[PDB]
PDB file of C-alpha atoms in Angstrom:
ATOM      1  CA  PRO A   1     132.142 -13.326 321.476  1.00  0.00           C
ATOM      2  CA  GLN A   2     128.837 -14.842 322.464  1.00  0.00           C
ATOM      3  CA  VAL A   3     129.380 -17.245 319.540  1.00  0.00           C
ATOM      4  CA  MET A   4     132.617 -18.140 317.747  1.00  0.00           C
ATOM      5  CA  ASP A   5     132.934 -18.908 314.041  1.00  0.00           C
ATOM      6  CA  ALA A   6     134.309 -21.972 312.286  1.00  0.00           C
ATOM      7  CA  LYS A   7     137.702 -22.447 310.632  1.00  0.00           C
ATOM      8  CA  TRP A   8     137.873 -23.010 306.869  1.00  0.00           C
ATOM      9  CA  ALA A   9     140.358 -25.127 304.912  1.00  0.00           C
ATOM     10  CA  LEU A  10     140.838 -26.274 301.318  1.00  0.00           C
ATOM     11  CA  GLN A  11     142.422 -29.443 299.983  1.00  0.00           C
ATOM     12  CA  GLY A  12     143.284 -30.819 296.558  1.00  0.00           C
ATOM     13  CA  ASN A  13     142.392 -34.361 295.525  1.00  0.00           C
ATOM     14  CA  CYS A  14     144.200 -36.205 292.742  1.00  0.00           C
ATOM     15  CA  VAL A  15     145.071 -39.846 292.076  1.00  0.00           C
ATOM     16  CA  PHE A  16     148.019 -40.960 289.944  1.00  0.00           C
ATOM     17  CA  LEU A  17     146.235 -43.105 287.390  1.00  0.00           C
ATOM     18  CA  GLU A  18     148.200 -45.173 284.891  1.00  0.00           C
ATOM     19  CA  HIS A  19     149.266 -43.588 281.587  1.00  0.00           C
ATOM     20  CA  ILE A  20     149.222 -46.144 278.767  1.00  0.00           C
ATOM     21  CA  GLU A  21     150.561 -43.249 276.572  1.00  0.00           C
ATOM     22  CA  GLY A  22     147.794 -43.838 273.999  1.00  0.00           C
ATOM     23  CA  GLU A  23     145.262 -42.274 276.354  1.00  0.00           C
ATOM     24  CA  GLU A  24     144.694 -38.695 277.448  1.00  0.00           C
ATOM     25  CA  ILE A  25     145.456 -37.493 280.969  1.00  0.00           C
ATOM     26  CA  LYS A  26     142.811 -37.067 283.689  1.00  0.00           C
ATOM     27  CA  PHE A  27     142.398 -34.118 286.054  1.00  0.00           C
ATOM     28  CA  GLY A  28     141.820 -33.538 289.762  1.00  0.00           C
ATOM     29  CA  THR A  29     139.635 -31.493 292.096  1.00  0.00           C
ATOM     30  CA  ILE A  30     139.602 -29.229 295.159  1.00  0.00           C
ATOM     31  CA  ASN A  31     137.161 -29.245 298.075  1.00  0.00           C
ATOM     32  CA  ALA A  32     136.583 -27.350 301.314  1.00  0.00           C
ATOM     33  CA  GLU A  33     136.055 -28.523 304.884  1.00  0.00           C
ATOM     34  CA  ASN A  34     134.982 -26.302 307.767  1.00  0.00           C
ATOM     35  CA  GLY A  35     135.414 -26.353 311.517  1.00  0.00           C
ATOM     36  CA  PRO A  36     132.751 -26.406 314.231  1.00  0.00           C
ATOM     37  CA  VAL A  37     131.261 -23.487 316.150  1.00  0.00           C
ATOM     38  CA  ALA A  38     131.213 -22.651 319.855  1.00  0.00           C
ATOM     39  CA  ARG A  39     129.111 -20.400 322.068  1.00  0.00           C
ATOM     40  CA  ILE A  40     129.306 -19.248 325.687  1.00  0.00           C
ATOM     41  CA  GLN A  41     126.522 -19.005 328.271  1.00  0.00           C
ATOM     42  CA  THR A  42     125.824 -16.875 331.349  1.00  0.00           C
ATOM     43  CA  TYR A  43     125.127 -18.124 334.859  1.00  0.00           C
ATOM     44  CA  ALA A  44     124.513 -16.275 338.102  1.00  0.00           C
ATOM     45  CA  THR A  45     122.956 -16.464 341.551  1.00  0.00           C
ATOM     46  CA  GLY A  46     122.659 -14.322 344.649  1.00  0.00           C
ATOM     47  CA  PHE A  47     121.228 -13.744 348.104  1.00  0.00           C
ATOM     48  CA  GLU A  48     118.806 -11.357 349.811  1.00  0.00           C
ATOM     49  CA  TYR A  49     119.039 -10.929 353.594  1.00  0.00           C
TER      50      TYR A  49
ATOM     51  CA  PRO B   1     164.112 -50.110 279.078  1.00  0.00           C
ATOM     52  CA  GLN B   2     160.354 -50.411 279.071  1.00  0.00           C
ATOM     53  CA  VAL B   3     160.963 -54.118 279.769  1.00  0.00           C
ATOM     54  CA  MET B   4     164.171 -55.520 281.272  1.00  0.00           C
ATOM     55  CA  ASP B   5     165.625 -58.761 279.946  1.00  0.00           C
ATOM     56  CA  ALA B   6     166.454 -61.860 281.971  1.00  0.00           C
ATOM     57  CA  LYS B   7     169.824 -63.212 283.114  1.00  0.00           C
ATOM     58  CA  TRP B   8     171.192 -66.563 281.956  1.00  0.00           C
ATOM     59  CA  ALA B   9     173.461 -69.208 283.453  1.00  0.00           C
ATOM     60  CA  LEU B  10     174.629 -72.670 282.390  1.00  0.00           C
ATOM     61  CA  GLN B  11     175.211 -75.491 284.873  1.00  0.00           C
ATOM     62  CA  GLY B  12     176.422 -79.074 284.866  1.00  0.00           C
ATOM     63  CA  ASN B  13     175.323 -82.300 286.522  1.00  0.00           C
ATOM     64  CA  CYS B  14     177.449 -85.343 287.343  1.00  0.00           C
ATOM     65  CA  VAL B  15     176.953 -88.253 289.757  1.00  0.00           C
ATOM     66  CA  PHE B  16     179.833 -90.353 291.123  1.00  0.00           C
ATOM     67  CA  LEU B  17     178.630 -93.904 290.472  1.00  0.00           C
ATOM     68  CA  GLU B  18     180.197 -97.213 291.529  1.00  0.00           C
ATOM     69  CA  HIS B  19     183.058 -98.789 289.552  1.00  0.00           C
ATOM     70  CA  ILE B  20     183.406-102.598 289.400  1.00  0.00           C
ATOM     71  CA  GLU B  21     185.803-104.432 287.031  1.00  0.00           C
ATOM     72  CA  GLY B  22     186.213-101.598 284.559  1.00  0.00           C
ATOM     73  CA  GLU B  23     182.542-100.730 284.136  1.00  0.00           C
ATOM     74  CA  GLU B  24     182.391 -97.898 281.611  1.00  0.00           C
ATOM     75  CA  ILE B  25     182.014 -94.529 283.328  1.00  0.00           C
ATOM     76  CA  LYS B  26     178.645 -92.826 282.955  1.00  0.00           C
ATOM     77  CA  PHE B  27     178.532 -89.347 281.452  1.00  0.00           C
ATOM     78  CA  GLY B  28     177.059 -86.125 282.805  1.00  0.00           C
ATOM     79  CA  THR B  29     174.821 -83.381 281.456  1.00  0.00           C
ATOM     80  CA  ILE B  30     174.427 -79.601 281.196  1.00  0.00           C
ATOM     81  CA  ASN B  31     171.376 -77.358 281.369  1.00  0.00           C
ATOM     82  CA  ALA B  32     170.305 -73.718 281.342  1.00  0.00           C
ATOM     83  CA  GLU B  33     168.737 -71.466 283.978  1.00  0.00           C
ATOM     84  CA  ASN B  34     167.167 -68.118 283.077  1.00  0.00           C
ATOM     85  CA  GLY B  35     166.151 -65.080 285.080  1.00  0.00           C
ATOM     86  CA  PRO B  36     162.744 -63.390 285.299  1.00  0.00           C
ATOM     87  CA  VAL B  37     161.379 -60.390 283.359  1.00  0.00           C
ATOM     88  CA  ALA B  38     160.423 -56.946 284.662  1.00  0.00           C
ATOM     89  CA  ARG B  39     158.837 -53.835 283.182  1.00  0.00           C
ATOM     90  CA  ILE B  40     158.037 -50.273 284.238  1.00  0.00           C
ATOM     91  CA  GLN B  41     154.776 -48.327 283.961  1.00  0.00           C
ATOM     92  CA  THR B  42     153.867 -44.644 283.716  1.00  0.00           C
ATOM     93  CA  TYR B  43     151.514 -42.754 286.022  1.00  0.00           C
ATOM     94  CA  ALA B  44     150.358 -39.161 285.585  1.00  0.00           C
ATOM     95  CA  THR B  45     147.595 -36.663 286.436  1.00  0.00           C
ATOM     96  CA  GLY B  46     147.177 -32.944 287.002  1.00  0.00           C
ATOM     97  CA  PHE B  47     144.936 -29.899 287.331  1.00  0.00           C
ATOM     98  CA  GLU B  48     143.336 -27.386 284.960  1.00  0.00           C
ATOM     99  CA  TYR B  49     142.307 -24.198 286.774  1.00  0.00           C
TER     100      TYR B  49
END
């Protein structure tokens, strides 16, 4: 194409906190990160004789 | 266990002293040597989707 699209990815984030056992558990998250874009140009030249 | 108990040992101490004209022999000693203590924790988290 004249321009190309990014690439998408998801990841999950969670940290193993301590469990004193008299305290309720804590939860994690997910987030997305995307790739970069590219585009292509045209060039040309010629003669006239 | 949640906490692990130490380890014990018993040792003795004696010093070869000099002996001149039936000097009464000196007498030794004993003592105790203990181990350290260790314990184990809990870690936990999760997701709710």
